[PDB]
Short mmCIF file of C-alpha atoms in Angstrom, two decimals:
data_model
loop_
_atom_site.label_atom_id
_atom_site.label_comp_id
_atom_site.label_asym_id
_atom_site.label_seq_id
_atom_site.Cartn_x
_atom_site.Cartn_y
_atom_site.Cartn_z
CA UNK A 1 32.67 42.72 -46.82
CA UNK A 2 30.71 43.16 -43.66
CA UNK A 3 28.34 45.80 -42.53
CA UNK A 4 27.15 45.29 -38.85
CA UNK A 5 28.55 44.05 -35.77
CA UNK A 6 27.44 40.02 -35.71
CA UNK A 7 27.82 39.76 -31.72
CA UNK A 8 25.89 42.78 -30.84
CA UNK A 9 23.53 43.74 -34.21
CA UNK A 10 24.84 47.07 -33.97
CA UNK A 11 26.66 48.68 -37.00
CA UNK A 12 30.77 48.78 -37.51
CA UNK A 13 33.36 50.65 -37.88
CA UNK A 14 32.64 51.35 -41.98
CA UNK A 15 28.52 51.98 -41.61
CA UNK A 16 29.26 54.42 -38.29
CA UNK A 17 31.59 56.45 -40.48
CA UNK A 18 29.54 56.51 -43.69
CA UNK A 19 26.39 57.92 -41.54
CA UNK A 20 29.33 60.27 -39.89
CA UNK A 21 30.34 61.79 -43.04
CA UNK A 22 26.91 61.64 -44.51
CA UNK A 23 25.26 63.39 -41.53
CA UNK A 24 28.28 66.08 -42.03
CA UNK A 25 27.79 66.63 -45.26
CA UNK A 26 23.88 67.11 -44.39
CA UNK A 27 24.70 69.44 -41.79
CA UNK A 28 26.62 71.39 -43.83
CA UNK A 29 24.08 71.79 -46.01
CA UNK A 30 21.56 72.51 -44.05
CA UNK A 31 23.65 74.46 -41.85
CA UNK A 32 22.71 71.55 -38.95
CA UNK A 33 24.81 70.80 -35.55
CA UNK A 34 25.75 67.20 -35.00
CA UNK A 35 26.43 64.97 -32.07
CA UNK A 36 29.37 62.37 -31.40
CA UNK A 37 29.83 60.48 -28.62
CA UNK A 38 32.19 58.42 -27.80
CA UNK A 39 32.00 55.46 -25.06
CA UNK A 40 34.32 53.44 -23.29
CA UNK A 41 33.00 50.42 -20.83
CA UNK A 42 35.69 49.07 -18.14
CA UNK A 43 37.04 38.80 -21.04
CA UNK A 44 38.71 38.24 -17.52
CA UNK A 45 37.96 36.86 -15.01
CA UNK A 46 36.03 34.45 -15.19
CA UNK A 47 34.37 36.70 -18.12
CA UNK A 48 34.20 35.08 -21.55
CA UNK A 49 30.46 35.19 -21.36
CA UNK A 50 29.93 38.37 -19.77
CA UNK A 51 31.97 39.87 -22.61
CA UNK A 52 29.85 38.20 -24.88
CA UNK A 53 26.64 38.79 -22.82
CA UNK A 54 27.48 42.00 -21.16
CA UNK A 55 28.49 43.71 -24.78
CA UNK A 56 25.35 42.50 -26.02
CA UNK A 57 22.94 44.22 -22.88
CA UNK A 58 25.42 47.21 -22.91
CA UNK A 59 24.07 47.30 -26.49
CA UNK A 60 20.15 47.02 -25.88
CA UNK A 61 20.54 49.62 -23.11
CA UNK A 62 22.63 51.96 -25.21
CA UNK A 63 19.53 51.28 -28.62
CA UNK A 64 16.91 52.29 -26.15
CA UNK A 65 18.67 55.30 -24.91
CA UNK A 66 18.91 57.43 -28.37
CA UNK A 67 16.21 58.37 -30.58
CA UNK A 68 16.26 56.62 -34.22
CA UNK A 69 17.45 58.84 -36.27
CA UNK A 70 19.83 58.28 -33.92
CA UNK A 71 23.26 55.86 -34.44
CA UNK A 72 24.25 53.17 -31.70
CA UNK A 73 27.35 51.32 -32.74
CA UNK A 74 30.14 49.19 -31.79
CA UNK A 75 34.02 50.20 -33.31
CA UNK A 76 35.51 46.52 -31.54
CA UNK A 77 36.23 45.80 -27.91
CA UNK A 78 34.08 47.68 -24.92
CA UNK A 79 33.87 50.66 -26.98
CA UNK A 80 30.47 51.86 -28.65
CA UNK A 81 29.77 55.11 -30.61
CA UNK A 82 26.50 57.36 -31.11
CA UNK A 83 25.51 59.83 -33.29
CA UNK A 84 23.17 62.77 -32.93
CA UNK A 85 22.42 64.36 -36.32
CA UNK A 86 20.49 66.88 -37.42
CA UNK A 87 20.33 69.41 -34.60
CA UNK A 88 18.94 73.02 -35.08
CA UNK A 89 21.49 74.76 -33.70
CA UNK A 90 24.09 74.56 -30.91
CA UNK A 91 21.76 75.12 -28.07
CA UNK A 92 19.60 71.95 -28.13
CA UNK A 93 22.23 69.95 -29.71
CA UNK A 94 23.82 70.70 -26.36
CA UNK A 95 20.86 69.26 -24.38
CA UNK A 96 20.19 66.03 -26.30
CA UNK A 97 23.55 65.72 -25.88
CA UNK A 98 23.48 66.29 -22.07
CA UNK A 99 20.12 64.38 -21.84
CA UNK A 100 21.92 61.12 -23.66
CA UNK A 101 24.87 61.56 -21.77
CA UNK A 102 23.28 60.65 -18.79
CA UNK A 103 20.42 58.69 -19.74
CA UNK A 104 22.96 56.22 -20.62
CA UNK A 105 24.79 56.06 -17.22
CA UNK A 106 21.91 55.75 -15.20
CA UNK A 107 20.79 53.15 -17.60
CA UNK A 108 24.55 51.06 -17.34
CA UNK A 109 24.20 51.54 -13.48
CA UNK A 110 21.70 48.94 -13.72
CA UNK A 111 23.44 45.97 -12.62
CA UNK A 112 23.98 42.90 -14.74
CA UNK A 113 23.51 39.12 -14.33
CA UNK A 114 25.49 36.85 -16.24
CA UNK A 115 27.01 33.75 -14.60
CA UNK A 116 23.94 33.99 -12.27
CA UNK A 117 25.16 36.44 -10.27
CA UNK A 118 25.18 40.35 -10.56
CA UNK A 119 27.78 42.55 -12.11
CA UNK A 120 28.23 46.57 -12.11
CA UNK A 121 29.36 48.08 -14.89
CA UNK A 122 31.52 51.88 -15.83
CA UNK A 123 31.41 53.20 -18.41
CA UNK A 124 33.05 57.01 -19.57
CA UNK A 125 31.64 59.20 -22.33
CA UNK A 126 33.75 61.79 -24.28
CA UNK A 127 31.26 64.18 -26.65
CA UNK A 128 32.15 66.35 -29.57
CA UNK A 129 30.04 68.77 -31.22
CA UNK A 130 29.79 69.24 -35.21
CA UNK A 131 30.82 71.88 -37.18
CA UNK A 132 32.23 73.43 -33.94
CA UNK A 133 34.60 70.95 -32.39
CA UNK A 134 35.02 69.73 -36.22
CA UNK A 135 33.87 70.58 -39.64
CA UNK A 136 35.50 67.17 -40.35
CA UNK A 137 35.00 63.43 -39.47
CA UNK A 138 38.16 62.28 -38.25
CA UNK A 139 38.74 65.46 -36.55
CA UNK A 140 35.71 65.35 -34.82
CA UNK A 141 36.57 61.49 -34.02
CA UNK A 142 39.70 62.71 -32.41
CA UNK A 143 38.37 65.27 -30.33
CA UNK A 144 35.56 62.84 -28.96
CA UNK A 145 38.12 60.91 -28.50
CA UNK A 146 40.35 63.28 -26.42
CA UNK A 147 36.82 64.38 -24.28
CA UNK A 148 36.37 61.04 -23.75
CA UNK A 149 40.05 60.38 -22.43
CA UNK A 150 39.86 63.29 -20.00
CA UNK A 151 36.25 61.72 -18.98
CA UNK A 152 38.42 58.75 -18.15
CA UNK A 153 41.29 60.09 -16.38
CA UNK A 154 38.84 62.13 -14.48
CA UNK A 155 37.14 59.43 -13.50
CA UNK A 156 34.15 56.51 -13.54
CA UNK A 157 30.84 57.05 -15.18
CA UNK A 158 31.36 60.13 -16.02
CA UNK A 159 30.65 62.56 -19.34
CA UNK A 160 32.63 65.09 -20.97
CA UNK A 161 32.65 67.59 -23.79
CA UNK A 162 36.17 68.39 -25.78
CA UNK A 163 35.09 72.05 -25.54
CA UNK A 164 35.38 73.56 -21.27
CA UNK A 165 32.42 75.57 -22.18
CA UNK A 166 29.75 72.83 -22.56
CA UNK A 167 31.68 71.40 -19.46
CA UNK A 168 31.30 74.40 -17.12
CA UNK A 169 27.46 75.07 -18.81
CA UNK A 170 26.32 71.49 -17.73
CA UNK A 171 27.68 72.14 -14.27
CA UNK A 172 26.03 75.83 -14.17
CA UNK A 173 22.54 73.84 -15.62
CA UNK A 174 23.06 71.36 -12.21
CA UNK A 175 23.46 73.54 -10.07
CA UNK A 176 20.51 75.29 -11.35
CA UNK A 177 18.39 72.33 -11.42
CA UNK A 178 18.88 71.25 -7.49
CA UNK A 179 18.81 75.13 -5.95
CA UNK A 180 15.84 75.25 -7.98
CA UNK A 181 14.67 71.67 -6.77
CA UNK A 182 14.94 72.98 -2.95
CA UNK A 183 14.08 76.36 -3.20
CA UNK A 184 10.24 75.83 -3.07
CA UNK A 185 10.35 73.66 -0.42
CA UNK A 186 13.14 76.40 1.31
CA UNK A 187 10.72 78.84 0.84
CA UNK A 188 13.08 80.69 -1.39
CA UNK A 189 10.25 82.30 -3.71
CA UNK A 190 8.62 86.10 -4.10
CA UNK A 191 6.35 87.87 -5.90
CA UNK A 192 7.16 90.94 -7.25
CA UNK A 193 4.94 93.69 -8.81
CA UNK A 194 4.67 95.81 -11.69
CA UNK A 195 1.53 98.05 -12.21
CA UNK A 196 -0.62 98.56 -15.13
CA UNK A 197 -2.41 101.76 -15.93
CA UNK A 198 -4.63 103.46 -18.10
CA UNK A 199 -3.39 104.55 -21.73
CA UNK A 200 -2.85 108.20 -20.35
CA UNK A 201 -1.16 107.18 -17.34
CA UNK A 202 -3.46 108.17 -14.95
CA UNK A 203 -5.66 105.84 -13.10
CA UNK A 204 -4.05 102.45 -11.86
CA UNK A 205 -6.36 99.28 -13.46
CA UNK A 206 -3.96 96.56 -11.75
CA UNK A 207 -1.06 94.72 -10.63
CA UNK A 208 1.18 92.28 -12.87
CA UNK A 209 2.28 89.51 -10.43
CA UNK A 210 5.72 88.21 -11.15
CA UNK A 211 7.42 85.68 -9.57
CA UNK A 212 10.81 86.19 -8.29
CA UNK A 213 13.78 84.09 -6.75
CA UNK A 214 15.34 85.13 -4.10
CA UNK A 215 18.66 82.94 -3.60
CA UNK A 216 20.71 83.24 -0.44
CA UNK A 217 23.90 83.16 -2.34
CA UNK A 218 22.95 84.44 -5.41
CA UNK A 219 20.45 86.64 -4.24
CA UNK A 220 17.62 87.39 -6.81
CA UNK A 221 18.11 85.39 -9.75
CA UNK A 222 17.13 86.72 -13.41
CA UNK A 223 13.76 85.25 -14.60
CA UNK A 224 15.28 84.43 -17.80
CA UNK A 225 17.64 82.09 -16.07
CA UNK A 226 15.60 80.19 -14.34
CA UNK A 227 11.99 80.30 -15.78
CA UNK A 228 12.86 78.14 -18.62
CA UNK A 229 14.37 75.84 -16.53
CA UNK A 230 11.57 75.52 -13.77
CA UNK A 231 9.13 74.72 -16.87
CA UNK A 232 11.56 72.52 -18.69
CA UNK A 233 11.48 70.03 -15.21
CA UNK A 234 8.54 69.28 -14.11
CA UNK A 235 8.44 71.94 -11.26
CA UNK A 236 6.23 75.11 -12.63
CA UNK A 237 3.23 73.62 -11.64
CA UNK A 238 3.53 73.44 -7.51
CA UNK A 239 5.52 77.15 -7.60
CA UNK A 240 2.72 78.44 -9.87
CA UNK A 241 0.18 77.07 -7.27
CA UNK A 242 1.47 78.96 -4.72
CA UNK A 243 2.06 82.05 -6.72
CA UNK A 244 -1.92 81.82 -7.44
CA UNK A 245 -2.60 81.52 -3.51
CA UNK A 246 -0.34 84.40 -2.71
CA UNK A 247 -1.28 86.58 -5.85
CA UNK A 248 -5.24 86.18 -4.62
CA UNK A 249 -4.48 86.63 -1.12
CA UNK A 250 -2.58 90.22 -1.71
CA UNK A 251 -5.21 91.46 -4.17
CA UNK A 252 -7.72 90.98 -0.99
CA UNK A 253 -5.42 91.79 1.45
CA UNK A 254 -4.72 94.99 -0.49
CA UNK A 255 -8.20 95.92 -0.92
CA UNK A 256 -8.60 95.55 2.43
CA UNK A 257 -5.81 97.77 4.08
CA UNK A 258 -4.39 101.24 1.82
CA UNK A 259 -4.45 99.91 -1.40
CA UNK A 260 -7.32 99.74 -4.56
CA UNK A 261 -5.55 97.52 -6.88
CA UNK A 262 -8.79 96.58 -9.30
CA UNK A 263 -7.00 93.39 -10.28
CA UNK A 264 -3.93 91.16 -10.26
CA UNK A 265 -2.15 89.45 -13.61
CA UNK A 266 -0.69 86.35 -13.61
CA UNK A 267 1.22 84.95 -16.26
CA UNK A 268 0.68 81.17 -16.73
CA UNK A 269 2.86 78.58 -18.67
CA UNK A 270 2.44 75.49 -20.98
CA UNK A 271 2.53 72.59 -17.82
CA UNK A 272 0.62 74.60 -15.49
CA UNK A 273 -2.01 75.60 -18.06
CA UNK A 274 -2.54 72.43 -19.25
CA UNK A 275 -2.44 70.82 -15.90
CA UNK A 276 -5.62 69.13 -14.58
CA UNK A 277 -6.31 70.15 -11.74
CA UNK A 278 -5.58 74.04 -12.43
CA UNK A 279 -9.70 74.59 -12.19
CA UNK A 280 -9.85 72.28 -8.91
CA UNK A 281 -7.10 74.52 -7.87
CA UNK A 282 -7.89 78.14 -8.91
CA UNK A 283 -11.72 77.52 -7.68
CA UNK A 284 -10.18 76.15 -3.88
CA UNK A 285 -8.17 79.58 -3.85
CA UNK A 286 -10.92 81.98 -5.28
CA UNK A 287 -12.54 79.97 -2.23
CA UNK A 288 -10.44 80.36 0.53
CA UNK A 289 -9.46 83.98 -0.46
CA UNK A 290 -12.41 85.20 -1.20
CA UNK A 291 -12.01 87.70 -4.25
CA UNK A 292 -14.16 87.81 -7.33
CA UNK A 293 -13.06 85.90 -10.09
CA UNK A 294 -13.24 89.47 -12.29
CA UNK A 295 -10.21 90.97 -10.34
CA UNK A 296 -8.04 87.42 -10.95
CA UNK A 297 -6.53 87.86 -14.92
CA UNK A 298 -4.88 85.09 -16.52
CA UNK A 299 -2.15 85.57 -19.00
CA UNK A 300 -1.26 83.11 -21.89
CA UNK A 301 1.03 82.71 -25.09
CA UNK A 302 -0.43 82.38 -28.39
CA UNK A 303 2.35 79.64 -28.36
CA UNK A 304 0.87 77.84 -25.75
CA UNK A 305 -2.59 78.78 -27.19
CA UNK A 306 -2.08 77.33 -30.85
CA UNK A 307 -0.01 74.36 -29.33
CA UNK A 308 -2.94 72.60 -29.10
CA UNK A 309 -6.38 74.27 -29.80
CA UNK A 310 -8.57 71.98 -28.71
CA UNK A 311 -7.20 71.77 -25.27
CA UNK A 312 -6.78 75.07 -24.92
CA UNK A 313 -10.81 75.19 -25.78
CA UNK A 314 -11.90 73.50 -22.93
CA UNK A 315 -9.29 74.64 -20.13
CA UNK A 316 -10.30 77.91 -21.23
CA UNK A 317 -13.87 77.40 -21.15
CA UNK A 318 -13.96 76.14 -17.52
CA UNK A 319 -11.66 79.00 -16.64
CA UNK A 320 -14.37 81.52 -18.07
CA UNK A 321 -16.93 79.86 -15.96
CA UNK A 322 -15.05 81.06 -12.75
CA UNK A 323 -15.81 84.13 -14.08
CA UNK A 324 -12.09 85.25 -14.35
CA UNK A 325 -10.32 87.19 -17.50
CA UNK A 326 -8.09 85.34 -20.16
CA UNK A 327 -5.45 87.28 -21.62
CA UNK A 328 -2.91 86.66 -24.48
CA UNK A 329 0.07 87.39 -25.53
CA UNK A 330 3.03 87.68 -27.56
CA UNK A 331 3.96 87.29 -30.87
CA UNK A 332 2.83 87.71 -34.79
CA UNK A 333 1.89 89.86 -36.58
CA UNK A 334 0.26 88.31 -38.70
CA UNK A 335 -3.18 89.91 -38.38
CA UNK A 336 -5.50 87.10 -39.23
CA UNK A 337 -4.21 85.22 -36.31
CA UNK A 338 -6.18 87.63 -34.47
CA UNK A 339 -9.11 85.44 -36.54
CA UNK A 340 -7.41 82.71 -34.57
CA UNK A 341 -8.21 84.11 -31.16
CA UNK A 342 -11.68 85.03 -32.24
CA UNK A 343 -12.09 81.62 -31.79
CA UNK A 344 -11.39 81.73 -27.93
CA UNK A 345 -12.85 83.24 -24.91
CA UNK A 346 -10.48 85.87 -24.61
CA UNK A 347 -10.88 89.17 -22.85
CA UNK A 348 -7.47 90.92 -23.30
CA UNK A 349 -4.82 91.54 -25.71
CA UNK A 350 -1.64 92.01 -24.97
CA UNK A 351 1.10 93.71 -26.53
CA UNK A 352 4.33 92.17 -26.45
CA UNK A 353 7.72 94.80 -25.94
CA UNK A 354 8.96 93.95 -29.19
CA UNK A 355 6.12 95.86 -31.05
CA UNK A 356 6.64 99.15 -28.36
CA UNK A 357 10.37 99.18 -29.07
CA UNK A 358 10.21 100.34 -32.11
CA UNK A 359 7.36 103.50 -31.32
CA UNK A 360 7.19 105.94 -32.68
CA UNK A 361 10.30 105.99 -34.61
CA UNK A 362 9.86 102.73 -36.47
CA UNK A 363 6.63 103.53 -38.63
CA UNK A 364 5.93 99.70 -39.19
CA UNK A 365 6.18 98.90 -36.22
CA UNK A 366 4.13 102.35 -35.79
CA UNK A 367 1.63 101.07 -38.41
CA UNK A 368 1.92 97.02 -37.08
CA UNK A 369 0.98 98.18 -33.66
CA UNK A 370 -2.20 100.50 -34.55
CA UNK A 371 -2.98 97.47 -36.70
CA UNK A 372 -2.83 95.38 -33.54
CA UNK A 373 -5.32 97.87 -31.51
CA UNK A 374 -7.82 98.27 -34.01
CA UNK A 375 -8.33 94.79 -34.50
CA UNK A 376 -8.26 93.94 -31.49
CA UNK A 377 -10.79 96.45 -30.23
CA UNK A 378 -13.22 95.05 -32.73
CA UNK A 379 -13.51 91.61 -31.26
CA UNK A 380 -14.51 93.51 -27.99
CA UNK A 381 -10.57 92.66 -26.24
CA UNK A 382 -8.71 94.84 -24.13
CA UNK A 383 -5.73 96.28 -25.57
CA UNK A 384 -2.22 97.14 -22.97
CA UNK A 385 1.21 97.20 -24.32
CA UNK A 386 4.40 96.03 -22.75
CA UNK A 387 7.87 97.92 -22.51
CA UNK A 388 6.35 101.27 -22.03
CA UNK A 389 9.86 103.09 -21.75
CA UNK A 390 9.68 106.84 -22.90
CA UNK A 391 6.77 109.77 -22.96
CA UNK A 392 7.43 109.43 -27.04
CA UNK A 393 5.88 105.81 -26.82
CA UNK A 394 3.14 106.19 -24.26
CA UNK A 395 1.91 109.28 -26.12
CA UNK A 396 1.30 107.66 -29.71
CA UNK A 397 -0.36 104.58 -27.68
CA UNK A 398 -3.01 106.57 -26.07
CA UNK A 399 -3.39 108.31 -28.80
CA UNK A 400 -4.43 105.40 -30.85
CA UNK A 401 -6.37 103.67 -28.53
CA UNK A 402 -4.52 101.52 -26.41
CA UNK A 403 -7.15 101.04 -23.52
CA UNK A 404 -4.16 100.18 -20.96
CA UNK A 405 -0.45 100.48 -20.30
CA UNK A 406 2.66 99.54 -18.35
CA UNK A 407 6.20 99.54 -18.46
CA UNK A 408 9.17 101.22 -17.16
CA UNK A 409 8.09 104.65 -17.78
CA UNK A 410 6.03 104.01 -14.90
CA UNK A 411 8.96 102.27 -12.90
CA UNK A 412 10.38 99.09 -11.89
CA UNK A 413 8.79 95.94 -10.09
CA UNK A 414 8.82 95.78 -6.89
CA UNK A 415 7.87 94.41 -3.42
CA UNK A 416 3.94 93.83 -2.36
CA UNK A 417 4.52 96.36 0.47
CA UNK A 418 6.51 98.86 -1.34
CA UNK A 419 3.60 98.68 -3.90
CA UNK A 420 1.03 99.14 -2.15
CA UNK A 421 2.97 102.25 -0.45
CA UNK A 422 3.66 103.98 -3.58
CA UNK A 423 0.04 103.35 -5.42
CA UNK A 424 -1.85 103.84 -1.12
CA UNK A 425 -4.55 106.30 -1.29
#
């Protein structure tokens, strides 16, 4: 009448399948993803204790591997099963899954002493995703099953998904993850430039740095693409240094050759703004370059600004005492969380493409977005909108206030040079 697993501590066959099916029925429900993993580990000779022994630390590794939540069990001989429940949807289900995956086989490449000597171990993980590779338990079972058979015939410590799309994704994400890793230290990063202007169009009031990858087999790589994933490792914070140094150092250079560019925006992200040593660093650049703080503009989320508000206090309060701009960003609205910002040392609003799209035709996003302006202009902040594409849109902004603009309209980012060529005086 048994529940667990007596050698290892880890539940059985019956408890693994009654979570299963629970966690299935819960994610049908609540229309949630779920993760099943299956694992195979590859007693003789002379192993009667390291079967015993071995199981056991296979066990503690694979526990400490898996949140808790989370379901480590054992279904009899070197085979173990997890389960992932309650996933929003099949993007991040993905990546826990991929971040288990192989969590666990650099944990089992730790070797193993037994018999008092060391002992390598391999061990081959098949993964099937709920209600996608099966609305249904066994179904699901068999599928994990059949990933984790081609796993196996494929190789040694190795993972696989029953679907070739997670398969050929996780390699795509790799590949990703080391160009990315060398391209810094390649040298394989640019800044590109899109202007702002006033709400009529006329007068230039600065430069919107953005940083651009320049791959020698894929060329120049969408931001999109690679963005998240420089921030999701912990890489964003060295690239955005040098973006900083090389941002400052055209805004001077360009003031001091053909080009008045009043100031340069740089957008910032969650590690890099809540890095340490971002003042140390910002101050040793303002330093070497020797622009005023004024023509340096920061640009934040109000996602990264409400993560955590009393952080974002004091980072932004030594930032302020450079004597640089803070600017924000993005989404709402949600009105009163302009109360929110009135709690900051903010400077500039910013108006995110996804209110513009919808000028002047859509008249609540029409409405929303002279909302957006008036408020803002009454705590004192600057006011540009993003996604400036046609005259129709530019024309109701400026006619409503909107103290700057830029967008498409205007053209597409470009080159330091070529910017400073087509804005020279």
């Amino acid at each position: 009448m048994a529940y667990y697993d007596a050698l290892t501590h880890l539940p059985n066959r019956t408890l693994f399948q009654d979570r299963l099916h629970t966690a299935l029925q819960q994610a049908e429900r609540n229309g949630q993803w779920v993760v099943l993993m299956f694992l195979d580990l590859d007693n003789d000779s002379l192993g009667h204790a390291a079967g015993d022994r071995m199981l056991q630390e296979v066990a503690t590794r694979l526990s400490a591997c898996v949140s808790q939540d989370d379901t480590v069990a054992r279904m009899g001989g070197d085979e173990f099963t997890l389960l992932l429940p309650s996933q929003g949807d099949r993007e991040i289900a993905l990546k826990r899954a991929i971040q288990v995956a192989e969590l666990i086989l650099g944990r089992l490449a730790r070797p193993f002493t037994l018999e008092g000597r060391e002992f390598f171990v391999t061990a081959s993980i098949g993964v099937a995703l709920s209600p996608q590779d099966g609305a249904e338990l066994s179904l699901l079972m068999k599928n994990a099953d059949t990933a984790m058979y081609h796993a196996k015939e494929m190789g040694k410590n190795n993972f696989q998904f029953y679907q070739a799309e997670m398969n050929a994704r996780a390699l795509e994400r790799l590949e990703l993850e080391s160009d990315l890793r060398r391209a810094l230290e390649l040298g394989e990063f640019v800044l590109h430039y899109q202007p702002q202007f006033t709400g009529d169009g006329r007068r230039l009031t600065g430069a919107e740095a953005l940083l651009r990858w320049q791959h020698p087999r894929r060329g120049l790589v969408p931001p999109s693409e690679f963005i998240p994933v420089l921030e999701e490792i912990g890489l964003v914070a060295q690239v955005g240094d040098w973006l900083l140094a090389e941002a400052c150092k055209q805004l001077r250079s360009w003031h001091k050759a053909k080009v008045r560019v009043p100031k340069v925006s740089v957008n910032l992200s969650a590690r890099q703004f809540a890095d340490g040593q971002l003042g140390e660093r910002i101050a040793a650049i303002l330093y070497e370059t020797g622009i005023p703080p004024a023509c340096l503009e920061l640009e934040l989320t109000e996602s990264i600004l409400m993560s955590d508000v009393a952080e974002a206090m004091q980072i932004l309060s030594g930032l302020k005492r450079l004597g640089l701009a803070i600017a924000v960003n993005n989404f709402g609205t949600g009105y009163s969380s302009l109360n929110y910002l009135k709690q900051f040392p903010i400077d500039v609003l910013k108006i995110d493409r996804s209110f513009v799209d919808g000028l002047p035709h859509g008249e609540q996003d029409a409405q929303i977005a002279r909302a957006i302006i008036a408020m803002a202009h009454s705590l004192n902040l600057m006011v540009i909108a993003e996604g400036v594409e046609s005259q129709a849109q530019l024309d109701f902004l400026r006619e409503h206030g909107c103290d700057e603009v830029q967008g498409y309209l205007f053209g597409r980012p470009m080159p330091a040079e070529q910017f400073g060529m087509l804005y020279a005086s």
